[PDB]
Design a protein around this ligand. Structure first.
Ligand SMILES: [K+]
Ligand SMILES: [K+]
Ligand SMILES: [K+]
Ligand SMILES: [K+]
Ligand SMILES: [K+]
Ligand SMILES: [Mg+2]
Ligand SMILES: [Mg+2]
Ligand SMILES: [Mg+2]
Ligand SMILES: [Mg+2]
Ligand SMILES: [Mg+2]
Ligand SMILES: [Mg+2]
Ligand SMILES: [Mg+2]
Ligand SMILES: [Mg+2]
Ligand SMILES: [Mg+2]
Ligand SMILES: [Mg+2]
Ligand SMILES: [Mg+2]
Ligand SMILES: [Mg+2]
Ligand SMILES: [Mg+2]
Ligand SMILES: [Mg+2]
Ligand SMILES: [Mg+2]
Ligand SMILES: [Mg+2]
Ligand SMILES: [Mg+2]
Ligand SMILES: [Mg+2]
Ligand SMILES: [Mg+2]
Ligand SMILES: [Mg+2]
Ligand SMILES: [Mg+2]
Ligand SMILES: [Mg+2]
Ligand SMILES: [Mg+2]
Ligand SMILES: [Mg+2]
Ligand SMILES: [Mg+2]
Ligand SMILES: [Mg+2]
Ligand SMILES: [Mg+2]
Ligand SMILES: [Mg+2]
Ligand SMILES: [Mg+2]
Ligand SMILES: [Mg+2]
Ligand SMILES: [Mg+2]
Ligand SMILES: [Mg+2]
Ligand SMILES: [Mg+2]
Ligand SMILES: [Mg+2]
Ligand SMILES: [Mg+2]
Ligand SMILES: [Mg+2]
Ligand SMILES: [Mg+2]
Ligand SMILES: [Mg+2]
Ligand SMILES: [Mg+2]
Ligand SMILES: [Mg+2]
Ligand SMILES: [Mg+2]
Ligand SMILES: [Mg+2]
Ligand SMILES: [Mg+2]
Ligand SMILES: [Mg+2]
Ligand SMILES: [Mg+2]
Ligand SMILES: [Mg+2]
Ligand SMILES: [Mg+2]
Ligand SMILES: [Mg+2]
Ligand SMILES: [Mg+2]
Ligand SMILES: [Mg+2]
Ligand SMILES: [Mg+2]
Ligand SMILES: [Mg+2]
Ligand SMILES: [Mg+2]
Ligand SMILES: [Mg+2]
Ligand SMILES: [Mg+2]
Ligand SMILES: [Mg+2]
Ligand SMILES: [Mg+2]
Ligand SMILES: [Mg+2]
Ligand SMILES: [Mg+2]
Ligand SMILES: [Mg+2]
Ligand SMILES: [Mg+2]
Ligand SMILES: [Mg+2]
Ligand SMILES: [Mg+2]
Ligand SMILES: [Mg+2]
Ligand SMILES: [Mg+2]
Ligand SMILES: [Mg+2]
Ligand SMILES: [Mg+2]
Ligand SMILES: [Mg+2]
Ligand SMILES: [Mg+2]
Ligand SMILES: [Mg+2]
Ligand SMILES: [Mg+2]
Ligand SMILES: [Mg+2]
Ligand SMILES: [Mg+2]
Ligand SMILES: [Mg+2]
Ligand SMILES: [Mg+2]
Ligand SMILES: [Mg+2]
Ligand SMILES: [Mg+2]
Ligand SMILES: [Mg+2]
Ligand SMILES: [Mg+2]
Ligand SMILES: [Mg+2]
Ligand SMILES: [Mg+2]
Ligand SMILES: [Mg+2]
Ligand SMILES: [Mg+2]
Ligand SMILES: [Mg+2]
Ligand SMILES: [Mg+2]
Ligand SMILES: [Mg+2]
Ligand SMILES: [Mg+2]
Ligand SMILES: [Mg+2]
Ligand SMILES: [Mg+2]
Ligand SMILES: [Mg+2]
Ligand SMILES: [Mg+2]
Ligand SMILES: [Mg+2]
Ligand SMILES: [Mg+2]
Ligand SMILES: [Mg+2]
Ligand SMILES: [Mg+2]
Ligand SMILES: [Mg+2]
Ligand SMILES: [Mg+2]
Ligand SMILES: [Mg+2]
Ligand SMILES: [Mg+2]
Ligand SMILES: [Mg+2]
Ligand SMILES: [Mg+2]
Ligand SMILES: [Mg+2]
Ligand SMILES: [Mg+2]
Ligand SMILES: [Mg+2]
Ligand SMILES: [Mg+2]
Ligand SMILES: [Mg+2]
Ligand SMILES: [Mg+2]
Ligand SMILES: [Mg+2]
Ligand SMILES: [Mg+2]
Ligand SMILES: [Mg+2]
Ligand SMILES: [Mg+2]
Ligand SMILES: [Mg+2]
Ligand SMILES: [Mg+2]
Ligand SMILES: [Mg+2]
Ligand SMILES: [Mg+2]
Ligand SMILES: [Mg+2]
Ligand SMILES: [Mg+2]
Ligand SMILES: [Mg+2]
Ligand SMILES: [Mg+2]
Ligand SMILES: [Mg+2]
Ligand SMILES: [Mg+2]
Ligand SMILES: [Mg+2]
Ligand SMILES: [Mg+2]
Ligand SMILES: [Mg+2]
Ligand SMILES: [Mg+2]
Ligand SMILES: [Mg+2]
Ligand SMILES: [Mg+2]
Ligand SMILES: [Mg+2]
Ligand SMILES: [Mg+2]
Ligand SMILES: [Mg+2]
Ligand SMILES: [Mg+2]
Ligand SMILES: [Mg+2]
Ligand SMILES: [Mg+2]
Ligand SMILES: [Mg+2]
Ligand SMILES: [Mg+2]
Ligand SMILES: [Mg+2]
Ligand SMILES: [Mg+2]
Ligand SMILES: [Mg+2]
Ligand SMILES: [Mg+2]
Ligand SMILES: [Mg+2]
Ligand SMILES: [Mg+2]
Ligand SMILES: [Mg+2]
Ligand SMILES: [Mg+2]
Ligand SMILES: [Mg+2]
Ligand SMILES: [Mg+2]
Ligand SMILES: [Mg+2]
Ligand SMILES: [Mg+2]
Ligand SMILES: [Mg+2]
Ligand SMILES: [Mg+2]
Ligand SMILES: [Mg+2]
Ligand SMILES: [Mg+2]
Ligand SMILES: [Mg+2]
Ligand SMILES: [Mg+2]
Ligand SMILES: [Mg+2]
Ligand SMILES: [Mg+2]
Ligand SMILES: [Mg+2]
Ligand SMILES: [Mg+2]
Ligand SMILES: [Mg+2]
Ligand SMILES: [Mg+2]
Ligand SMILES: [Mg+2]
Ligand SMILES: [Mg+2]
Ligand SMILES: [Mg+2]
Ligand SMILES: [Mg+2]
Ligand SMILES: [Mg+2]
Ligand SMILES: [Mg+2]
Ligand SMILES: [Mg+2]
Ligand SMILES: [Mg+2]
Ligand SMILES: [Mg+2]
Ligand SMILES: [Mg+2]
Ligand SMILES: [Mg+2]
Ligand SMILES: [Mg+2]
Ligand SMILES: [Mg+2]
Ligand SMILES: [Mg+2]
Ligand SMILES: [Mg+2]
Ligand SMILES: [Mg+2]
Ligand SMILES: [Mg+2]
Ligand SMILES: [Mg+2]
Ligand SMILES: [Mg+2]
Ligand SMILES: [Mg+2]
Ligand SMILES: [Mg+2]
Ligand SMILES: [Mg+2]
Ligand SMILES: [Mg+2]
Ligand SMILES: [Mg+2]
Ligand SMILES: [Mg+2]
Ligand SMILES: [Mg+2]
Ligand SMILES: [Mg+2]
Ligand SMILES: [Mg+2]
Ligand SMILES: [Mg+2]
Ligand SMILES: [Mg+2]
Ligand SMILES: [Mg+2]
Ligand SMILES: [Mg+2]
Ligand SMILES: [Mg+2]
Ligand SMILES: [Mg+2]
Ligand SMILES: [Mg+2]
Ligand SMILES: [Mg+2]
Ligand SMILES: [Mg+2]
Ligand SMILES: [Mg+2]
Ligand SMILES: [Mg+2]
Ligand SMILES: [Mg+2]
Ligand SMILES: [Mg+2]
Ligand SMILES: [Mg+2]
Ligand SMILES: [Mg+2]
Ligand SMILES: [Mg+2]
Ligand SMILES: [Mg+2]
Ligand SMILES: [Mg+2]
Ligand SMILES: [Mg+2]
Ligand SMILES: [Mg+2]
Ligand SMILES: [Mg+2]
Ligand SMILES: [Mg+2]
Ligand SMILES: [Mg+2]
Ligand SMILES: [Mg+2]
Ligand SMILES: [Mg+2]
Ligand SMILES: [Mg+2]
Ligand SMILES: [Mg+2]
Ligand SMILES: [Mg+2]
Ligand SMILES: [Mg+2]
Ligand SMILES: [Mg+2]
Ligand SMILES: [Mg+2]
Ligand SMILES: [Mg+2]
Ligand SMILES: [Mg+2]
Ligand SMILES: [Mg+2]
Ligand SMILES: [Mg+2]
Ligand SMILES: [Mg+2]
Ligand SMILES: [Mg+2]
Ligand SMILES: [Mg+2]
Ligand SMILES: [Mg+2]
Ligand SMILES: [Mg+2]
Ligand SMILES: [Mg+2]
Ligand SMILES: [Mg+2]
Ligand SMILES: [Mg+2]
Ligand SMILES: [Mg+2]
Ligand SMILES: [Mg+2]
Ligand SMILES: [Mg+2]
Ligand SMILES: [Mg+2]
Ligand SMILES: [Mg+2]
Ligand SMILES: [Mg+2]
Ligand SMILES: [Mg+2]
Ligand SMILES: [Mg+2]
Ligand SMILES: [Mg+2]
Ligand SMILES: [Mg+2]
Ligand SMILES: [Mg+2]
Ligand SMILES: [Mg+2]
Ligand SMILES: [Mg+2]
Ligand SMILES: [Mg+2]
Ligand SMILES: [Mg+2]
Ligand SMILES: [Mg+2]
Ligand SMILES: [Mg+2]
Ligand SMILES: [Mg+2]
Ligand SMILES: [Mg+2]
Ligand SMILES: [Mg+2]
Ligand SMILES: [Mg+2]
Ligand SMILES: [Mg+2]
Ligand SMILES: [Mg+2]
Ligand SMILES: [Mg+2]
Ligand SMILES: [Mg+2]
Ligand SMILES: [Mg+2]
Ligand SMILES: [Mg+2]
Ligand SMILES: [Mg+2]
Ligand SMILES: [Mg+2]
Ligand SMILES: [Mg+2]
Ligand SMILES: [Mg+2]
Ligand SMILES: [Mg+2]
Ligand SMILES: [Mg+2]
Ligand SMILES: [Mg+2]
Ligand SMILES: [Mg+2]
Ligand SMILES: [Mg+2]
Ligand SMILES: [Mg+2]
Ligand SMILES: [Mg+2]
Ligand SMILES: [Mg+2]
Ligand SMILES: [Mg+2]
Ligand SMILES: [Mg+2]
Ligand SMILES: [Mg+2]
Ligand SMILES: [Mg+2]
Ligand SMILES: [Mg+2]
Ligand SMILES: [Mg+2]
Ligand SMILES: [Mg+2]
Ligand SMILES: [Mg+2]
Ligand SMILES: [Mg+2]
Ligand SMILES: [Mg+2]
Ligand SMILES: [Mg+2]
Ligand SMILES: [Mg+2]
Ligand SMILES: [Mg+2]
Ligand SMILES: [Mg+2]
Ligand SMILES: [Mg+2]
Ligand SMILES: [Mg+2]
Ligand SMILES: [Mg+2]
Ligand SMILES: [Mg+2]
Ligand SMILES: [Mg+2]
Ligand SMILES: [Mg+2]
Ligand SMILES: [Mg+2]
Ligand SMILES: [Mg+2]
Ligand SMILES: [Mg+2]
Ligand SMILES: [Mg+2]
Ligand SMILES: [Mg+2]
Ligand SMILES: [Mg+2]
Ligand SMILES: [Mg+2]
Ligand SMILES: [Mg+2]
Ligand SMILES: [Mg+2]
Ligand SMILES: [Mg+2]
Ligand SMILES: [Mg+2]
Ligand SMILES: [Mg+2]
Ligand SMILES: [Mg+2]
Ligand SMILES: [Mg+2]
Ligand SMILES: [Mg+2]
Ligand SMILES: [Mg+2]
Ligand SMILES: [Mg+2]
Ligand SMILES: [Mg+2]
Ligand SMILES: [Mg+2]
Ligand SMILES: [Mg+2]
Ligand SMILES: [Mg+2]
Ligand SMILES: [Mg+2]
Ligand SMILES: [Mg+2]
Ligand SMILES: [Mg+2]
Ligand SMILES: [Mg+2]
Ligand SMILES: [Mg+2]
Ligand SMILES: [Mg+2]
Ligand SMILES: [Mg+2]
Ligand SMILES: [Mg+2]
Ligand SMILES: [Mg+2]
Ligand SMILES: [Mg+2]
Lengths: 273, 88
RNA sequence: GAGCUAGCCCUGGCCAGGGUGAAGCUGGGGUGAGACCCAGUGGAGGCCCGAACCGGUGGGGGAUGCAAACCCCUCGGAUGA
RNA sequence: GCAGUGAACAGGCUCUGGCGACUGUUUACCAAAAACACAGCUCUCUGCGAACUCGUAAGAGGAGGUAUAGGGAGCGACGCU
RNA sequence: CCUAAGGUAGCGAAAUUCCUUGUCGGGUAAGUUCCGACCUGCACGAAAAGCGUAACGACCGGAGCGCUGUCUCGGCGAGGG
RNA sequence: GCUAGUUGGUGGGGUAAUGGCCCACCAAGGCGACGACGGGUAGCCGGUCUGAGAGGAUGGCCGGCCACAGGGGCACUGAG
RNA sequence: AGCGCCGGCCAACUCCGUGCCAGCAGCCGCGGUAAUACGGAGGGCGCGAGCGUUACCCGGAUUCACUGGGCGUAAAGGGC
RNA sequence: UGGGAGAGGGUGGUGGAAUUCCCGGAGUAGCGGUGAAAUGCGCAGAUACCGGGAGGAACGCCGAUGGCGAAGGCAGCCACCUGGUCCACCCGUGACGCUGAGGCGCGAAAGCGUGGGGAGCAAACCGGAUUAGAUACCCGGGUAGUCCACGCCCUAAACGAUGCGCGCUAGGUCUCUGGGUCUCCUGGGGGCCGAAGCUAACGCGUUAAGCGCGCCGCCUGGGGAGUACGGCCGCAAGGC
RNA sequence: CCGAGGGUAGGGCCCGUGACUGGGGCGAAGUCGUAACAAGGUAGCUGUACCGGAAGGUGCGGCUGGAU
RNA sequence: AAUGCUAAU
């Protein structure tokens, strides 16, 4: 339900914004926020290592619980759905019967007032977290660990999900958000349901300034540069590429594969994306 | 569906005399019950056009009955629409 | 050597006055119910006019200069990248 | 009274082509533009100790992000293609 | 006859046309520029995108009106030298 | 879709006389698919021609009414 | 004493000349070497101080059908 | 009030047959295709066979001159929500009716927009044949599209080329579905043959194109032309 | 004050005309093919979409005003 | 599997 605007300015003609109607609380929980260090794409040497970054809105980091086997068997009540500036998905504030408060990625269909629980004996309901081997084949899951007790790594962006395809010994075959079929250890944890905020990809930024609000600085084409700066630089007037298209550092950028050939995890990938 | 109990309750509610089942008031009340239930159904089943034609037929029949009642007894007509909340 | 200049990071400050009138909301209309329509309210925007401020368009002057880039008239932006 | 924003401050207008959609940015000191950027479109890489960048390395950035994400390339609102 | 295949839609004397001030129409008393067409495209053409496009531009063309020491064509006066 | 003296009211001016005819003020009305408004065409009738009738066409001459007097506007005199 | 007509509609026919030419024509159509259809002649028919032609109106036209038409396949039933 | 039949509509599930693809097994000299071939596929191991898995789309027999719907249309099975319609009882109201210029809603296929999906088929496109040529018919491939959600488009041989309502005018025969006094009679649908009548004829004929009444739409020689202009609608194609 | 008329500016509608460009009707003869009428030699027609010198072809659905 | 036949009874 993306919100549109009448064209009372040139930029408002196309710009769309998120509805925000699912958000119930407008201030983050004080005990679960930490200051976030803006880098501008610089490393500890002070050098730009990722180009065209910096200058966005100030942000606070919210601590997300990505290892839900920490509190197996202790139910929690969903207190609120909140805005999180650091990720595309919304977050959910959990009020454990323990009196402990934690944030999780808010799944699609989670409501304030429901009960969630983690553990091998949890019901198969949206928001519950279980080891993969206890979850039926065909279930849609998100926030999936890659290796046991190492933290959720897969299917965390808004609207993404993974689906269990089958079992093989100690391993469970998963279809990843990218379409890749992968074997994941059956003792890895996952949460039932898909990530919410599936409309996030329908947002139209509308103007250059909105990209700047998000910390994305302007991108300069290689063909706009001089030969000293880029393989595509130079030429009198506009020029075609004049060679296979390349990065600023020389490698070809249309089809050249870059995954390391002899990587150990290749034994656990059944079909590439 | 509409069971016999609620229909009989409506019939007793709106009938003039105890043995009456086909007066204008009772017919209007039964039509209003059916129209309310069908409109509630159509609020969820939007693509149910075939049922919507029947709803249009019911609305037209009730309009004809109300016109006749208003033309033959304005006091009865006003009392009936006030009791049913028809106007709009 | 980044006390000039380019980018970024932390923490502060500044932007006279006037105009336009989005959404939302309220009331009326409309209908089987609606979608919609009208008025009022409302105060949105890399919105408008214009000083500070930031620029530097056209012309004239300056040319062993007031000045190793200035002066005068004119001109762009001015709640935002 | 010749004359009433009586002094000062305060758009000349219209018609019709090219280029760029638009607000912006740029050769400090001869070029402000049709150049750059831009929302948007497409291709391609990347399953996470991710690809990629800096570094001899340790270690950083990427990101306390996880394919609705991140990098690279070309095109550059929108309409018809 | 030759080729891997022989330029499709659209556009065209063009920010692209050498002959060239092509030719025809318009605008002017008179128009190498301008606008509308034709196609003989030296040497347009589909994301180094093709053809359009309201709004926007200290961008670059062409025309008219208003008004003027720009000019016919110069004259006088003021202040600083 | 049309209308702002427009539609109505009050008071007045003017006329032989009613009247928004004209003026000042008050209200927001008036007209329209039964065709308003706009465009085109046209002097109208008794009659005439045609036709089995119904109808169609037409309005020269003659009798009646209206309009006009180089193209527009205006008043004076007067019963007019 | 003249004018029109003489293939059918429509009343009134033969000869010569020409040869898809010249020409006629309201419609259908005539004329390309034996033309009652073109031109002339003889004859005939209709009107006659007239006879033809053009223009316009009604009729025939029940072909806007009130009197007095239609819509399966001829024009015509609206997608429901 | 009591009952009936039905691919009428919407939503959620789930059954097997078959095609395709992948994995494994076994196995070898061609398969496929046509009028005849060739392109193509195949020793880098195809075709034919067996086992396992995935996915999409459509529902064989029943099945019909059958049924339902206002039309367009509707077909595996199950559940839920919902429309219409028929019969019996003769209970209630008391003319409350018919038609309908505009308006509103629905409306095959193709087409358009944004997401998803994609087995098979298949406009455009590529190649092989055929042929004088072959921008086709035949063959091998192949993208939109065909499917789903939402939103547009609004057309057709949208046909019974037959507007709707009501009454009256021999019958015979087949069939679906009710009630009864279940030989048979009495309702409601769908077909065939035929009285009278009608029609230019073909044909129609109680499901009228007969005899009548009411209301609506449409026609006035063929072409130009469903064109142009104007107006309204649509993102476009284009529609009225 | 009103006021015939004249002037200035901006609109609405209509008529004539225009380089060029699009189709239409016609023709006792031309060029290219042969789409329809017979099962017209691929049944025809039709709405829509894409394509092709041209008539037309193909896809999806529909009708019989076709056959079996 | 096979295209065509102007123009005066
Ligand atoms: K760029
Ligand atoms: K408002
Ligand atoms: K200009
Ligand atoms: K040219
Ligand atoms: K050129
Ligand atoms: Mg918007
Ligand atoms: Mg708005
Ligand atoms: Mg708007
Ligand atoms: Mg705007
Ligand atoms: Mg704009
Ligand atoms: Mg803007
Ligand atoms: Mg913008
Ligand atoms: Mg806050
Ligand atoms: Mg804090
Ligand atoms: Mg350092
Ligand atoms: Mg250093
Ligand atoms: Mg980088
Ligand atoms: Mg950076
Ligand atoms: Mg920045
Ligand atoms: Mg930021
Ligand atoms: Mg900030
Ligand atoms: Mg968030
Ligand atoms: Mg994210
Ligand atoms: Mg930000
Ligand atoms: Mg960036
Ligand atoms: Mg970025
Ligand atoms: Mg920057
Ligand atoms: Mg940026
Ligand atoms: Mg780039
Ligand atoms: Mg360059
Ligand atoms: Mg450069
Ligand atoms: Mg180098
Ligand atoms: Mg280099
Ligand atoms: Mg280069
Ligand atoms: Mg070059
Ligand atoms: Mg260059
Ligand atoms: Mg250079
Ligand atoms: Mg150059
Ligand atoms: Mg250059
Ligand atoms: Mg060049
Ligand atoms: Mg350059
Ligand atoms: Mg170029
Ligand atoms: Mg270049
Ligand atoms: Mg070059
Ligand atoms: Mg390049
Ligand atoms: Mg090159
Ligand atoms: Mg290269
Ligand atoms: Mg490359
Ligand atoms: Mg990797
Ligand atoms: Mg330094
Ligand atoms: Mg510095
Ligand atoms: Mg600095
Ligand atoms: Mg400093
Ligand atoms: Mg700086
Ligand atoms: Mg900065
Ligand atoms: Mg900073
Ligand atoms: Mg800071
Ligand atoms: Mg600060
Ligand atoms: Mg700060
Ligand atoms: Mg600061
Ligand atoms: Mg302050
Ligand atoms: Mg300011
Ligand atoms: Mg200010
Ligand atoms: Mg202010
Ligand atoms: Mg201000
Ligand atoms: Mg303003
Ligand atoms: Mg203001
Ligand atoms: Mg205002
Ligand atoms: Mg404001
Ligand atoms: Mg502004
Ligand atoms: Mg402004
Ligand atoms: Mg302005
Ligand atoms: Mg401005
Ligand atoms: Mg401005
Ligand atoms: Mg200033
Ligand atoms: Mg300043
Ligand atoms: Mg500055
Ligand atoms: Mg300054
Ligand atoms: Mg300044
Ligand atoms: Mg600068
Ligand atoms: Mg300047
Ligand atoms: Mg000057
Ligand atoms: Mg100047
Ligand atoms: Mg100067
Ligand atoms: Mg000066
Ligand atoms: Mg100068
Ligand atoms: Mg000088
Ligand atoms: Mg100077
Ligand atoms: Mg200097
Ligand atoms: Mg200065
Ligand atoms: Mg100044
Ligand atoms: Mg200024
Ligand atoms: Mg300004
Ligand atoms: Mg500025
Ligand atoms: Mg600026
Ligand atoms: Mg501005
Ligand atoms: Mg500013
Ligand atoms: Mg300011
Ligand atoms: Mg300003
Ligand atoms: Mg401002
Ligand atoms: Mg601010
Ligand atoms: Mg502002
Ligand atoms: Mg800002
Ligand atoms: Mg005075
Ligand atoms: Mg004077
Ligand atoms: Mg004066
Ligand atoms: Mg005055
Ligand atoms: Mg002044
Ligand atoms: Mg003044
Ligand atoms: Mg003054
Ligand atoms: Mg002053
Ligand atoms: Mg000004
Ligand atoms: Mg200004
Ligand atoms: Mg002026
Ligand atoms: Mg101008
Ligand atoms: Mg011009
Ligand atoms: Mg031009
Ligand atoms: Mg311009
Ligand atoms: Mg030019
Ligand atoms: Mg261009
Ligand atoms: Mg620009
Ligand atoms: Mg530019
Ligand atoms: Mg533009
Ligand atoms: Mg543009
Ligand atoms: Mg742009
Ligand atoms: Mg553009
Ligand atoms: Mg741009
Ligand atoms: Mg453009
Ligand atoms: Mg702007
Ligand atoms: Mg600005
Ligand atoms: Mg601006
Ligand atoms: Mg600017
Ligand atoms: Mg600019
Ligand atoms: Mg700048
Ligand atoms: Mg700047
Ligand atoms: Mg800068
Ligand atoms: Mg720049
Ligand atoms: Mg320089
Ligand atoms: Mg400079
Ligand atoms: Mg500069
Ligand atoms: Mg600098
Ligand atoms: Mg320098
Ligand atoms: Mg300069
Ligand atoms: Mg410059
Ligand atoms: Mg500038
Ligand atoms: Mg600028
Ligand atoms: Mg400059
Ligand atoms: Mg500029
Ligand atoms: Mg550029
Ligand atoms: Mg630049
Ligand atoms: Mg934009
Ligand atoms: Mg956009
Ligand atoms: Mg675009
Ligand atoms: Mg992309
Ligand atoms: Mg990418
Ligand atoms: Mg990569
Ligand atoms: Mg990189
Ligand atoms: Mg290392
Ligand atoms: Mg690192
Ligand atoms: Mg970091
Ligand atoms: Mg890191
Ligand atoms: Mg990326
Ligand atoms: Mg990218
Ligand atoms: Mg590209
Ligand atoms: Mg490329
Ligand atoms: Mg650019
Ligand atoms: Mg573009
Ligand atoms: Mg570019
Ligand atoms: Mg072309
Ligand atoms: Mg061009
Ligand atoms: Mg062009
Ligand atoms: Mg030229
Ligand atoms: Mg020329
Ligand atoms: Mg051009
Ligand atoms: Mg030239
Ligand atoms: Mg030259
Ligand atoms: Mg010349
Ligand atoms: Mg010239
Ligand atoms: Mg010329
Ligand atoms: Mg000429
Ligand atoms: Mg001229
Ligand atoms: Mg001129
Ligand atoms: Mg002239
Ligand atoms: Mg002239
Ligand atoms: Mg002239
Ligand atoms: Mg001349
Ligand atoms: Mg000329
Ligand atoms: Mg010039
Ligand atoms: Mg010039
Ligand atoms: Mg010129
Ligand atoms: Mg020119
Ligand atoms: Mg030109
Ligand atoms: Mg020109
Ligand atoms: Mg020419
Ligand atoms: Mg042309
Ligand atoms: Mg040429
Ligand atoms: Mg071009
Ligand atoms: Mg291309
Ligand atoms: Mg290129
Ligand atoms: Mg290219
Ligand atoms: Mg471009
Ligand atoms: Mg263009
Ligand atoms: Mg352009
Ligand atoms: Mg436009
Ligand atoms: Mg605009
Ligand atoms: Mg524009
Ligand atoms: Mg414009
Ligand atoms: Mg504007
Ligand atoms: Mg503009
Ligand atoms: Mg403006
Ligand atoms: Mg501007
Ligand atoms: Mg402009
Ligand atoms: Mg500009
Ligand atoms: Mg300038
Ligand atoms: Mg300038
Ligand atoms: Mg500029
Ligand atoms: Mg200039
Ligand atoms: Mg120009
Ligand atoms: Mg200009
Ligand atoms: Mg000029
Ligand atoms: Mg002039
Ligand atoms: Mg002038
Ligand atoms: Mg002088
Ligand atoms: Mg002078
Ligand atoms: Mg002067
Ligand atoms: Mg002069
Ligand atoms: Mg001179
Ligand atoms: Mg001189
Ligand atoms: Mg001179
Ligand atoms: Mg002189
Ligand atoms: Mg002088
Ligand atoms: Mg002198
Ligand atoms: Mg002088
Ligand atoms: Mg003097
Ligand atoms: Mg002098
Ligand atoms: Mg002097
Ligand atoms: Mg002197
Ligand atoms: Mg002085
Ligand atoms: Mg002196
Ligand atoms: Mg002196
Ligand atoms: Mg008055
Ligand atoms: Mg009056
Ligand atoms: Mg009145
Ligand atoms: Mg009479
Ligand atoms: Mg008589
Ligand atoms: Mg009579
Ligand atoms: Mg008369
Ligand atoms: Mg008269
Ligand atoms: Mg007169
Ligand atoms: Mg006279
Ligand atoms: Mg007298
Ligand atoms: Mg008198
Ligand atoms: Mg005879
Ligand atoms: Mg003859
Ligand atoms: Mg004769
Ligand atoms: Mg003879
Ligand atoms: Mg004769
Ligand atoms: Mg003779
Ligand atoms: Mg008679
Ligand atoms: Mg007759
Ligand atoms: Mg008659
Ligand atoms: Mg008759
Ligand atoms: Mg009649
Ligand atoms: Mg008839
Ligand atoms: Mg018929
Ligand atoms: Mg008939
Ligand atoms: Mg026919
Ligand atoms: Mg007819
Ligand atoms: Mg017919
Ligand atoms: Mg029908
Ligand atoms: Mg029809
Ligand atoms: Mg239908
Ligand atoms: Mg082989
Ligand atoms: Mg095998
Ligand atoms: Mg599949
Ligand atoms: Mg149906
Ligand atoms: Mg029904
Ligand atoms: Mg009874
Ligand atoms: Mg009674
Ligand atoms: Mg009736
Ligand atoms: Mg009516
Ligand atoms: Mg449809
Ligand atoms: Mg169909
Ligand atoms: Mg479809
Ligand atoms: Mg589609
Ligand atoms: Mg072929
Ligand atoms: Mg051959
Ligand atoms: Mg095929
Ligand atoms: Mg196939
Ligand atoms: Mg495909
Ligand atoms: Mg039908
Ligand atoms: Mg019909
Ligand atoms: Mg009929
Ligand atoms: Mg009807
Ligand atoms: Mg029967
Ligand atoms: Mg029967
Ligand atoms: Mg029969
Ligand atoms: Mg029969
Ligand atoms: Mg029968
Ligand atoms: Mg008949
Ligand atoms: Mg007729
Ligand atoms: Mg049309
Ligand atoms: Mg039109
Ligand atoms: Mg539109
Ligand atoms: Mg049409
Ligand atoms: Mg004309
Ligand atoms: Mg055919
Ligand atoms: Mg044939
Ligand atoms: Mg044929
Ligand atoms: Mg033949
Ligand atoms: Mg054939
Ligand atoms: Mg055939
Ligand atoms: Mg054929
Ligand atoms: Mg046939
Ligand atoms: Mg056939
Ligand atoms: Mg077809
Ligand atoms: Mg298409
Ligand atoms: Mg084809
Ligand atoms: Mg033949
Ligand atoms: Mg033949
Ligand atoms: Mg031939
Ligand atoms: Mg033959
Ligand atoms: Mg023959
Ligand atoms: Mg023949
Ligand atoms: Mg023959």
């Amino acid at each position: 339900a993306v919100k549109k605007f009448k064209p009372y300015t040139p930029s408002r003609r196309f710009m769309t914004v998120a509805d925000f109607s699912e958000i119930t609380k407008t201030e983050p929980e004080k005990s679960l926020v930490k200051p976030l260090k803006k880098t501008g794409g610089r490393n500890n040497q002070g050098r730009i290592t990722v180009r065209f970054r910096g200058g966005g809105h100030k942000r606070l980091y919210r601590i997300i619980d990505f290892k839900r086997w920490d509190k197996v068997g202790i139910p929690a009540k969903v207190a609120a759905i909140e805005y999180d500036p650091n990720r595309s998905a919304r977050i959910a504030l959990l009020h454990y019967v323990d009196g402990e408060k934690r944030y999780i990625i808010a799944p699609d269909g989670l409501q304030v007032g429901q009960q969630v629980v983690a553990g091998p004996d949890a019901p198969i309901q949206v928001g519950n977290a279980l080891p993969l081997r206890f979850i039926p084949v065909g279930t849609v899951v998100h926030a999936v660990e890659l290796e046991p007790k190492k933290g959720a790594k897969l299917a965390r962006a808004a609207g993404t999900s993974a689906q269990i395809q089958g079992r093989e010994g100690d391993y469970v075959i998963l279809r990843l958000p990218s379409g890749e079929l992968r074997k994941v250890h059956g003792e890895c944890y996952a949460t039932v349901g898909a990530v919410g905020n599936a409309d996030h990809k329908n947002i139209v930024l509308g103007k250059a300034g909105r990209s700047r609000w998000l910390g994305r600085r302007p991108h300069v084409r290689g063909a706009a540069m001089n030969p000293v700066d880029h393989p595509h630089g130079g030429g009198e007037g506009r020029a075609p590429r004049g060679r296979p298209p390349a990065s600023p550092w020389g490698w070809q950028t249309k089809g050249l594969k870059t995954r390391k050939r002899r990587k150990p995890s290749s034994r656990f990938i059944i079909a590439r994306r | 569906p509409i069971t016999k109990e609620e229909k009989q309750k409506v019939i007793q509610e709106f009938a003039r005399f105890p043995g009456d089942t086909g007066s204008t008031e009772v017919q209007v009340a039964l039509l209003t019950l059916r129209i309310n239930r069908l409109s509630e159904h159509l609020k969820v089943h939007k693509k149910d056009h075939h049922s919507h034609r029947g709803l249009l037929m019911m609305v037209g029949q009730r309009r004809r009955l109300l016109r006749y009642l208003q033309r033959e007894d304005p006091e009865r007509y006003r009392a009936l629409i006030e009791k049913l909340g028809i106007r709009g």
